[PDB]
């Protein structure tokens, strides 16, 4: 018996192995903060961009007071709560307060707009939605009004700022009350997957498997109480939350520093001010920092570890990390769905430069298969399938996609093309899945294509990735015009999609109009040949 339905537990034989192995320790996720605050109450746990500062005892107490405040509002025991917050202390407090209240955080990104928020809110049956007031020029309270209109289950809107007619997040506060602990085998939080279908899919992560993800990652990356970690990616990104991210830093007793943006302006200042020792970035930001040290004066010497992942970092800039930034590079090839691959900190530089790591867990199982599902020969390229103690067995409330995406014996089809080296390290070679990787931001083609086809001048749309030297891929929208109507150009389509509620990183970089798409012999749109036509071949 589980608190939520709609997810796929591990078979009992696997659960037993993972507990017997010490991977699944049987502790709720919020207990990482409870135990650290008990052992190191007066250590500095959290620093925000302004310079404000909180000890472990202070953070633990505020999480209890906000958890009691959430319960007074009726948020708790299994309720799903959509969280959309910037890199501020409000996110860290509320994350633990929701866990202690028994609520299941549904983590979204600040860039997400009405179509993503409404979909995840109604899929999760969320009862509350947590937003900033105004963030980067956008008023999220209008979005909460639109979300509540489309999703009647949303009873409460909690606002980090001026709350308007809603509830101020700072007012969610009451005297701590004894709260029951969740079952560690239950879902702890729901992550948003980059997606390969028409709708974003939610990833359930349990207390046991997410704690192991965090704990094992902190060991591999050498996180301990000396670690000062700069959160450069959104706090809701799996990389910055758990790999080892801020949760790993808190679990071991280090200091979390919240960066408002990844710009050298904000990040380099915080690295010098707080003596940051570790951070994680996507490759486009790595390239920016590697350039920017040539004209920025910040003292970055305290930096010891730069994690780079989300897309493949080139071997040439990888080799520049030590001379330019004075720290160790760690390549990270991971996914919200589970499997994490890390280069080890003392790997020879050859493997740090040329590979995307080897799996985190001894019980991470990998297969590399050809187009027929058969295992490839050693060192051949094929699609990565994986199964392990923190990889999901199914998405949340997505039975049809689960039937397509997981093998009969529980292997998750990643859609990534890789080859495995004799040492066990992986090299990422490409992608099979119909999803564009734009600077670490994942764009489901079919989701974007369906939005574009809602435009009155568009009959059919095919979204195709184009190579980009610094961004990895950019997005080309190939359009068949509506009969007797003109298709829109790039700027009009961007405005249409933005008004529709599509996140800005999904807006096509380029529009190409054509009378028909090339098709295969089954009749599916041939995007390999669309790429050729886009390039004038």
Ligand X SMILES: Nc1ncnc2c1ncn2[C@@H]1O[C@@H](COP(=O)(O)OC(=O)c2ccccc2O)[C@@H](O)[C@H]1O
455 is in an annotated binding site: yes
Q: Is 335 in the site for ligand X (CB under 6 A)?
A: yes
Q: Of residues 44, 97, 243, 366, which one binds ligand X by CB under 6 A? A: 243
- Binding mask of the shown chain, residues 187 to 226, with x at each position contacting ligand X by CB under 6 A: -------x--------------------------------
Question: CA-CA distances (angstroms) from residue 165 to 155, 161, 216?
Answer: 13, 12, 43
Q: Which does 235 bind (CB under 5 to 8 A by kind): ligand X, Mg ion, none?
A: none
DSSP 3-state helix, strand, coil percentages of the chain (rounded to 5)? Answer: 35, 25, 40
Q: What angle do CA 209, 212, 213 make, to 5 degrees?
A: 85
Contact window for Mg ion (CB under 5 A) among 20-28, 88-96, 174-182, 303-311: 303-311
Tell me the number of residues near Mg ion by CB under 5 A. Answer: 4
Contact window for Mg ion (CB under 5 A) among 54-62, 233-241, 300-308, 520-528: 300-308
Taking the CB of residue 89, how many other CB atoms lie within 10 A of it? 21
Q: Of residues 238, 330, 343, 405, which one binds ligand X by CB under 6 A? A: 238
Q: Which does 327 bind (CB under 5 to 8 A by kind): ligand X, Mg ion, none?
A: Mg ion
Q: Are 313 and 353 in contact (CB under 8 A)?
A: no
Q: Of residues 333, 390, 395, 517, which one binds ligand X by CB under 6 A? A: 333
Q: Which of 331, 291, 311, 336 is nearest to 438 (CA)?
A: 311
Measured from the CB atom, is 207 or 312 closer to ligand X?
312
CA distance 239 to 346: 21
Q: Of residues 281, 336, 398, 477, which one binds ligand X by CB under 6 A? A: 336
195 is in an annotated binding site: no
Taking the CB of residue 440, how many other CB atoms lie within 10 A of it? 21
Contact window for Mg ion (CB under 5 A) among 24-32, 321-329, 333-341, 494-502: 321-329
Q: Is 418 left (phi over 0), alpha (psi -120 to 50) or beta?
A: beta
Shortest reach from residue 428's CB to ligand X, in Å: 4
What is the number of the residue whose Cβ is closest to Mg ion?
326
Q: Of residues 109, 216, 286, 332, which one binds ligand X by CB under 6 A? A: 332
Contact window for ligand X (CB under 6 A) among 112-120, 163-171, 262-270, 327-335: 327-335
Measured from the CB atom, is 87 or 414 closer to ligand X?
414
Q: Is 275 in the site for Mg ion (CB under 5 A)?
A: no
Q: Phi and psi for 373 in degrees, rounded to 5?
A: 80, 5
Q: Is 96 in the site for ligand X (CB under 6 A)?
A: no
427 is in an annotated binding site: no
Q: Are 351 and 315 in contact (CB under 8 A)?
A: no
- Give me the half-sphere count of Cα atoms (radius 13 Å) on the Cβ side of residue 166: 26
Measured from the CB atom, is 112 or 455 closer to ligand X?
112
CA distance 202 to 6: 11
Q: Is 310 in the site for ligand X (CB under 6 A)?
A: yes
What kind and span of H or E run contains 119? helix 114-124
Window 433 to 462, contacts with ligand X (CB under 6 A): 437, 442
Q: Are 104 and 81 in contact (CB under 8 A)?
A: yes
Residue 145 burial (10 A CB sphere; 0-12, 13-18, 19+): middle
Q: Phi and psi for 450 in degrees, rounded to 5?
A: -65, -40
Q: Is 385 in the site for ligand X (CB under 6 A)?
A: no
Q: Are strands 358-359 and 104-107 parallel, antiparallel or unpaired?
A: unpaired
Shortest reach from residue 473's CB to Mg ion, in Å: 31
Q: Is 231 in the site for Mg ion (CB under 5 A)?
A: no
134 is in an annotated binding site: no
Q: Of residues 416, 447, 449, 473, which one binds ligand X by CB under 6 A? A: 416
Q: Of residues 158, 192, 303, 494, which one binds Mg ion by CB under 5 A? A: 303
Bridge partners, 158 (sequence order): 130, 167
Local structure of residue 469 (DSSP, 8 states): T
Q: Which of 358, 418, 365, 413 is nearest to 389 (CA)?
A: 365
Shortest reach from residue 303's CB to Mg ion, in Å: 5
Helical pair 140-150 and 114-124, crossing angle rounded to 10 deg: 40
Q: Is 414 in the site for ligand X (CB under 6 A)?
A: yes
Q: Of residues 197, 356, 386, 475, which one binds ligand X by CB under 6 A? A: 356
Tell me the number of residues near ligand X by CB under 6 A. Answer: 21
Shortest reach from residue 203's CB to ligand X, in Å: 8
Shortest reach from residue 44's CB to ligand X, in Å: 26
Helical pair 31-39 and 56-72, crossing angle rounded to 10 deg: 140
Window 500 to 519, contacts with Mg ion (CB under 5 A): none
Q: Are 407 and 413 in contact (CB under 8 A)?
A: yes
Shortest reach from residue 482's CB to ligand X, in Å: 33
Q: Is 428 in the site for ligand X (CB under 6 A)?
A: yes
Q: Is 326 in the site for Mg ion (CB under 5 A)?
A: yes
CA distance 286 to 315: 12
326 is in an annotated binding site: yes
Q: Are 19 and 26 in contact (CB under 8 A)?
A: yes
Question: CA-CA distances (angstroms) from residue 226 to 275, 278, 304, 399?
Answer: 10, 10, 11, 44
Which residue numbers belong to the known binding site for AMP?
310, 332, 334, 336, 416, 433, 442
Which residue numbers belong to the known binding site for Mg(2+)?
301, 303, 326, 453, 455, 458
Which residues would be at the binding site for ligand X (CB under 6 A)? Answer: 194, 238-239, 243, 309-312, 331-336, 356, 414, 416, 428, 431, 437, 442
Which residues would be at the binding site for Mg ion (CB under 5 A)? Answer: 301, 303, 326-327
């Amino acid at each position: 018996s589980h608190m939520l339905d709609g997810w796929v537990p591990w078979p009992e034989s696997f659960a037993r192995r993972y507990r017997a192995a010490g991977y699944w320790e049987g502790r709720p996720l919020d207990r990482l903060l409870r135990e650290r605050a008990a052992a190191d109450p007066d250590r500095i746990a959290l620093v925000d961009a302004a310079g404000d500062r909180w000890t472990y005892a202070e953070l633990d107490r505020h999480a209890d007071r906000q958890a009691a405040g959430l319960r007074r509002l009726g948020i708790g025991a299994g309720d799903r709560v959509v969280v959309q917050l910037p890199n501020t202390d409000a996110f860290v407090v509320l994350f633990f307060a929701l866990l202690r209240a028994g609520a299941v955080p549904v983590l979204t990104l600040p860039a997400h707009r009405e179509s993503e928020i409404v979909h995840v809110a109604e899929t999760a049956g969320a009862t509350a939605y947590v937003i900033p007031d105004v963030l980067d020029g956008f008023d999220h309270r209008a979005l909460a009004r639109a979300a509540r209109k489309a999703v009647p289950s949303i009873e409460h809107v909690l606002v980090a700022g001026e709350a308007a007619e809603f509830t101020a997040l700072a007012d969610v506060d009451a005297a701590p009350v004894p709260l029951a602990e969740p079952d560690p085998g239950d879902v702890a939080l729901l992550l948003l997957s980059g997606g390969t279908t028409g709708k974003p899919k939610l990833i359930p992560r349990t207390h046991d498997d997410y704690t192991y993800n965090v704990r094992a990652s902190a060991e591999v990356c050498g996180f301990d109480s000396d670690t000062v970690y700069l959160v450069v990616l959104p706090t809701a990104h799996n990389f910055a939350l758990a790999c080892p991210g801020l949760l790993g830093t808190l679990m071991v007793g280090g200091t979390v520093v919240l960066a408002p943006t990844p710009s050298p302006e904000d990040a380099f200042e915080l690295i010098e001010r707080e003596k940051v020792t570790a951070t994680a970035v996507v490759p486009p930001v790595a390239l920016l920092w590697l350039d920017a040290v040539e004209w920025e004066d910040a003292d970055l010497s305290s930096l010891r570890l730069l994690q780079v992942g989300g897309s493949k970092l080139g071997a040439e800039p990888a080799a520049r990390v030590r001379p330019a930034l004075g720290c160790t590079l760690q390549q990270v090839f991971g996914m919200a769905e589970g499997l994490l691959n890390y280069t080890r900190l003392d790997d020879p530089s050859d493997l740090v430069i040329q590979t995307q790591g080897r799996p985190l867990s001894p019980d991470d199982e990998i297969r590399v298969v050809d187009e027929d599902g058969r295992d490839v020969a050693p060192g051949e390229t094929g699609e990565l399938l994986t199964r392990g103690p923190y990889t999901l067995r199914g998405y949340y409330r997505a039975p049809e996609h689960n039937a397509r995406t997981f093998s009969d014996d529980g292997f998750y089809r990643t859609g990534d093309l890789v080859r495995v080296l004799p040492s066990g390290h992986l090299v990422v070679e490409g992608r099979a899945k119909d999803q564009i990787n734009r600077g670490g931001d994942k764009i489901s083609a079919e989701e974007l294509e369906n939005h574009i086809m809602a435009h009155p001048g568009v009959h059919d749309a095919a979204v195709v990735g184009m190579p980009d030297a610094t961004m990895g891929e950019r997005t080309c929208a190939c359009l068949v015009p509506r009969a007797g109507r003109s298709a829109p150009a790039q700027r009009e389509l961007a405005a249409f999609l933005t008004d529709r509620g599509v996140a800005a990183y999904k807006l096509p970089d380029r529009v190409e109009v054509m009378d028909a798409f090339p098709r295969t012999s089954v009749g599916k749109t041939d995007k390999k040949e669309l790429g050729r036509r886009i390039a004038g071949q």
